[PDB]
Write a protein that binds this ligand. Structure first.
Ligand SMILES: CCc1ccccc1-c1cccc2c1CC(C(=O)NC[C@@H](N)C(=O)O)N2
Ligand SMILES: CCc1ccccc1-c1cccc2c1CC(C(=O)NC[C@@H](N)C(=O)O)N2
Lengths: 274, 268
């Protein structure tokens, strides 16, 4: 049985590029000489084949080899991570897992309570926090800043629509006007919001620290500010009683102990130049 | 249903004190003035009821209040975390033989243990460090004193932890295993005292525990981060009907401020 793997565009965990003329992927190599491994993902580009690669595709490839299965990677239809909205239905990668469109989510998918009620998560492959991406020289103290708590058109802030960050701000935050403001401004994808911070369309992007710290490392105009809230993991997503549960988690724990995960960090995440 | 909980002495996760004359626990309060919740636990000191409290005990009480199991707690008989040497000893051993239904302790999540039992989602994520006397600095595992050992610098860990059998099995660490096989301790608290007495020069152990010890004691510091990070989790047998509700509760305790409050109370 071929596992339908679903994923999403999210650097540096998943890079998405167009194929060449002949339908292959461009032969790239890391600075240390090793081949960069890529797969033919299908999905929307504004269904046609594209080249997928990164932290999470290297991980997919590991698990494939260890558990001996075949995969067909596809990009989530709506371009979302997945929330549950009013009959309350799950969207994004979460919706696709449950409805059968996917067999496995391989992505920087945040492990939380809500989602774990409906799917199985592997043991975390990474552990990380929330932070705020801003222009260099924009001191944010924390969650309770004046410009946030008392919002305005002079200082716009946002997150990505239909992530666990979004529904938590809508449904759960102890603050009225913040979600009213944020609902006006939230972005469809993380790449768009990161670019908006650069082009001054957005003054603060609330998002995964693993993505934003990587982004700030490569962009000297951008800094992160805050360890907001608490830490949470990324894990593989599966249906609650699929027979892969045990071995996916065994593989990830083995990957942490034999240094394979540390290597994925060195290849894709750990970077500095500013 | 009623669950048999097995736990282990490991400050600040589990403290163990004598009961009163009449076999009850005295009421105590924290630095804040909060009520120290305590549970009767049986075990060694000749098997007497004792009083058990701390991070892991507050976590057990929370799990019980969410899912409505009753419990009786006891301290592991042989005193150990558990290694496979194909039968397990320690808390692993008790859980597998049915002397416990659930392990509640700073129990390291690793591949080998996860082949035999279910772990919950982690309640804490941490790593290995070294407890030394202040003024000692260690770069990492490849410090001369570790790589090429002697009586001039004693170093050790606790017998029958994950650490122990990991050092004993690695071909790379052959030279270290033979020196540690002379000096490995029975309990963490014994090893920690040795660092103060200058009977042990370097104790290799969990950062959550050793960072707490250095906070209390100005003579001690932690130096380094060895290897990689790993979690603590609740242990259960593979076919426990509580494993889904345990993990859900742990995930929610990260998101509702509960774990953070345990940190303020017991750790910082
Ligand atoms: C908000 C805080 C929060 C509330 C309730 C539960 C979890 C968190 C949490 C804590 C720390 C990082 C992080 C999240 C969500 C989150 C996120 O949504 N990331 C985007 C993406 N990885 C995706 O899966 O939606 N990242
Ligand atoms: C390279 C040691 C190792 C090998 C394989 C898998 C994980 C680790 C690891 C990494 C980070 C902290 C920590 C350990 C073990 C460990 C330990 O054994 N502590 C004692 C106690 N918590 C108990 O559960 O036995 N503490």
């Amino acid at each position: 049985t071929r596992l339908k793997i679903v994923t999403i565009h999210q650097e540096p965990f998943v890079y998405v590029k167009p194929t060449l003329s002949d339908g292959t992927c461009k032969e790239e190599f890391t600075v240390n000489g090793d081949p960069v491994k890529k797969v033919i993902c299908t999905g929307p580009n504004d269904t046609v084949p594209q080249c997928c690669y990164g932290f999470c595709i290297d991980l997919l490839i590991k698990l494939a080899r260890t558990m001996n299965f075949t995969y067909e990677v596809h990009l989530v239809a709506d371009g979302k991570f997945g929330t549950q909205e009013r009959k309350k239905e799950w969207n994004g990668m979460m919706g696709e897992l449950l409805s059968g469109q996917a067999d496995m989510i391989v992505a920087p998918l945040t492990i939380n309570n809500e989602r774990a009620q409906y799917i199985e998560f592997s043991k975390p492959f990474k552990y990380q926090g929330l932070t705020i991406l801003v222009k260099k020289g924009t001191r944010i103290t924390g969650i309770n800043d004046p410009r946030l708590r008392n919002p305005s058109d002079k200082f716009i802030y946002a997150t990505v629509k239909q992530s666990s960050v979004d529904i938590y701000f809508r449904r759960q935050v102890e603050l009225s006007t913040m979600y009213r403001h944020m609902e006006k401004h939230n972005y469809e994808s993380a790449a768009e919001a990161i670019q908006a911070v650069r082009d001054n369309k957005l003054h603060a992007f609330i998002w995964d620290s693993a993505v934003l710290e990587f982004e700030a490392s490569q962009k000297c105009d951008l800094v992160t500010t805050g360890e907001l809230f608490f830490r949470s993991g990324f894990g593989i997503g599966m249906r609650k009683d699929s027979p892969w549960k045990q071995n996916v988690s065994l593989s990830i724990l083995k990957s942490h102990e034999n240094g394979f995960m540390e290597d994925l960090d060195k290849t894709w995440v750990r970077y500095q130049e500013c």
